[PDB]
Swiss-Prot record, chain C:
A GO biological-process term: ribosomal large subunit assembly
Residue list for modification N5-methylglutamine: Q150
HAMAP family, per database record: Ribosomal_uL3_B (MF_01325_B)
InterPro entries xrefs: Ribosomal_uL3, Ribosomal_uL3_bac/org-type, Ribosomal_uL3_CS, Transl_B-barrel_sf
Organism the protein comes from: Escherichia coli (strain K12)
Cleaved signal peptide residues: none
GO function terms (MF aspect): rRNA binding; structural constituent of ribosome
Name recorded for this polypeptide: Large ribosomal subunit protein uL3
Family assignment from sequence similarity: Belongs to the universal ribosomal protein uL3 family.
One cellular component term from this protein's GO annotations in UniProt: cytosolic large ribosomal subunit
Keywords in alphabetical order: Methylation, Ribonucleoprotein, Ribosomal protein, RNA-binding, rRNA-binding
Maturation and modification: Methylated by PrmB.
Length: 176, 38, 209, 140, 58
RNA sequence: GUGCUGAAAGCAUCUAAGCACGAAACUUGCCCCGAGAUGAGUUCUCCCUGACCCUUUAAGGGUCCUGAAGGAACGUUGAAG
RNA sequence: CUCGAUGUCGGCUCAUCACAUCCUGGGGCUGAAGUAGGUCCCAAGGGUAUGGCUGUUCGCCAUUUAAAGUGGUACGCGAGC
């Protein structure tokens, strides 16, 4: 189908700072930076930007697609704030935030602490949750993965570290 | 199962995916037909 | 990072109901540091060590003189060491048979494998059937006759043949220690220890890692 | 008279210093192999003893073209049977450019004796300029 | 012979491939190789001979 | 094998940019050999500083006086052979 | 290709490689609750039975084992038995 990529406005609080391949973006939560296409650059007119390849062929426009989409999450990141819960399904399960050292008891003999890489906060409201608090959906991703990975819910119960909205068909059972 | 054979996509809610050729059959339905020839 | 000393027999301290104490007396007579280097023309840390009653009178010459580099009493053959952050030629130049290495831990030893001289299959393996009496054809001990018929073969290099024997390293590793009497030089282990009173041994802490 | 310039037994040796910090990697070997023979050289009839004298620097800056950064068979089997064969990919070996890679010239030389005369005798190193363990004198 | 001509003539422009081609064009100018070793004794001649080809190549 | 973020392909997607895990396999860690590593490496210490000649003279060739550090030889031997 | 000679099967001894892996290691699906399995992917580090009957290889049987792998090597091996 028809794709596109272009709409990326610079709201308030955020701050642009291009530099060809390299680029950052200040904001309440922070900034960032990342490699990109070498012979290609963006372009900050006023409120929006316009990524653009200096060559017309197949592996061209495609590079922009991931560019402008990547910057979206940035402004959204420094201003909006990024979250992602995790519900602990299973008896003895209970996450307990203690800052940079989440302490978990997931059935495994002995508890297991998952040091959180500086960049995302968490605070289980009840003795049963896990809420991520960061700006980089990238980074929060992994932390969210390893969190669930600690004991992802198996299709027979769901008893595991499922994401809040994690629709699991734990409906699996029987013999015959 | 994961299926190492060489079938195709099949079904409806199954994606193709291209990381290495993997015909794949991933579907929220059942992992049964995934067919990752790897 | 440690000292070396002649084995010299082994005994036990037959506990009442035990004898667990099965060490091997290894008179640990101190060394003579002072000798070492760093990056200015050499390798790494290192540390020379020499301990014995070499007749400083007559036998070894150049070495005695080689020892003059701010040392004291030239013993037998000198060995080296490595890092550990030890002292140096800036304070004494005379180690001891004890320091900070700890205690009770396990200390490995490396005597000198004797050597039964030339040895065979049966010998360097302890495995090869056959008889002797109605034999007298393949009378046991033969290599037991090893190889092919008509084959590339190459007799397959490295296959365990006769081979000889003789003084060789070893290294036991592990081996806790029941006692020690500094100055008196009296280190004990727990059996094992290669050699037979006519060795040297390195007695290192424990490269367990 | 019989035309053929003699073999003054490696008459002259012109010293040089490549960079290797470049981007040509494998391509460079040829103009590195041609050189230690009789490339730029006109007279000094090759075939017979001869050579030149150049030197490599860091060289650690190579990537080859395709995914060669990740390939290159490389094994240095030994007279040990017992199933040996030490295969290590290029990047796995690029960690310490030794008798290999930079030494891609060896397989490019006449091989055996005499060619063997040039061999590593060009020096390699891997750090460019610092403490040139090599002869500091005249070079280009 | 060509191994050296290819090694001598090219250093001063135009490879052995182009060399004989320049040389090729002439009414009388054609003196073969062998003596081609000029690169060893009469370099000036030889380089003065590479122009006879370089400048010669149409 | 598992994934993240992610376009190509208004989603989706483990990948095309880009990060992260991951086995008795591979490199290493442990033990032995190991500078003939002719690419013959390093460091420490010891010993030798008397006269002349003929050449086709920088190549040497040769005589007398010296002979060290050390090695070896012999002998007494060895848990070494 | 060997008939101016390349000694057969099985056993013993001692092996070396392959992977289409028997055990152990890591994974995917399961008509996978668990325990145990089924199957497929990856993986050759190491390990991989004593006897009764028979010339046997093999096989059946008794009893073990984590397991008692398939195959190449002149159906490996008689100037070795």
């Amino acid at each position: 189908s028809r794709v596109a990529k272009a709409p990326v406005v610079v709201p308030a609080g955020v701050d642009v700072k291009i530099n060809g391949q390299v680029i950052t973006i200040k904001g309440k939560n922070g900034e960032l930076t990342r490699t990109l296409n070498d012979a290609v650059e963006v372009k900050h007119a006023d409120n929006t930007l316009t990524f653009g390849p200096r060559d017309g062929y197949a592996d061209g426009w495609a590079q922009a697609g991931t560019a402008r989409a990547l910057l979206n999450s940035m402004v959204i990141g420094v201003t909006e704030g990024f979250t992602k819960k995790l519900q602990l399904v299973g008896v003895g399960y209970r996450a307990a935030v203690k800052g940079n050292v989440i302490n978990l008891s997931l059935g495994f003999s002995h508890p297991v602490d998952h040091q959180l890489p500086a960049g995302i906060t968490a605070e289980c409201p009840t003795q049963t949750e896990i809420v991520l608090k960061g700006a980089d959906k990238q980074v929060i991703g992994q932390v969210a993965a390893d969190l669930r990975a600690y004991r992802r819910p198996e299709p027979y119960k769901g008893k595991g570290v499922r994401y809040a909205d994690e629709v699991v068909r734990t409906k699996e059972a029987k013999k015959k | 199962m994961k299926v190492r054979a060489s079938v195709k996509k099949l079904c409806r809610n199954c994606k193709i995916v291209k990381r290495d050729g993997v015909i794949r059959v991933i579907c929220s339905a059942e992992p049964k037909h995934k067919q990752r020839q790897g | 990072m440690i000292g070396l000393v002649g084995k010299k027999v082994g005994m036990t301290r037959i506990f009442t109901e035990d004898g667990v104490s099965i060490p091997v007396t290894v008179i640990e007579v101190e060394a003579n540091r002072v000798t070492q280097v760093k990056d200015l023309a050499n390798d790494g840390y290192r540390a020379i060590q020499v301990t014995t009653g070499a007749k400083k009178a007559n036998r070894v010459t150049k070495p005695e003189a080689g020892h003059f580099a701010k040392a004291g009493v030239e013993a037998g053959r000198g060995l080296w060491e490595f890092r550990l952050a030890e002292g140096e030629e800036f304070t004494v130049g005379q180690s001891i048979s004890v320091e900070l290495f700890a205690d009770v831990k396990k200390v490995d030893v490396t005597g000198t494998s004797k050597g039964k001289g030339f040895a065979g299959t049966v010998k360097r393996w302890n495995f090869r059937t056959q008889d002797a009496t109605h034999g007298n054809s393949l009378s046991h001990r033969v290599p037991g006759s090893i190889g092919q018929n008509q084959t590339p073969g190459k007799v397959f290099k490295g296959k365990k043949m006769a081979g000889q024997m003789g003084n060789e390293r070893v290294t036991v590793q592990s081996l806790d220690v029941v006692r020690v009497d500094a100055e008196r030089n009296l280190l004990l282990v727990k059996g094992a220890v290669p050699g037979a009173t006519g060795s040297d041994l390195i007695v290192k802490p424990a490269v367990k890692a | 008279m019989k035309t053929f310039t003699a073999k003054p037994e490696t008459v002259k040796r012109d010293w040089y210093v490549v960079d290797a910090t470049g981007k040509t990697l494998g391509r460079l070997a040829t103009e590195l192999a041609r050189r230690l023979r009789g490339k730029h050289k006109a007279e000094y009839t090759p075939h017979v003893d001869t050579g030149d004298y150049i030197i490599v620097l860091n060289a650690d800056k190579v990537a080859v073209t395709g995914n060669k950064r990740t390939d290159k068979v490389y094994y240095h089997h030994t007279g040990h049977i017992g199933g040996i064969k030490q295969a290590t990919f290029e990047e796995m070996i690029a960690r310490r450019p030794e008798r290999v890679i930079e030494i891609a010239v060896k397989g490019m030389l006449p091989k055996g004796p005499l060619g063997r005369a040039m061999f590593r005798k060009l020096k390699v190193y891997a750090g460019n300029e610092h403490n040139h363990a090599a002869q500091q004198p005249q070079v280009l | 012979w060509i191994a050296r001509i290819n090694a001598a003539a090219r250093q001063n422009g135009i490879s052995y491939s182009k060399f004989i081609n320049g040389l090729k064009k002439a009414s009388v100018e054609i003196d073969r190789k062998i003596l081609a070793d000029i690169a060893v004794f009469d370099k000036v001649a030889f380089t003065a001979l590479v122009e006879k080809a370089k400048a010669a190549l149409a």
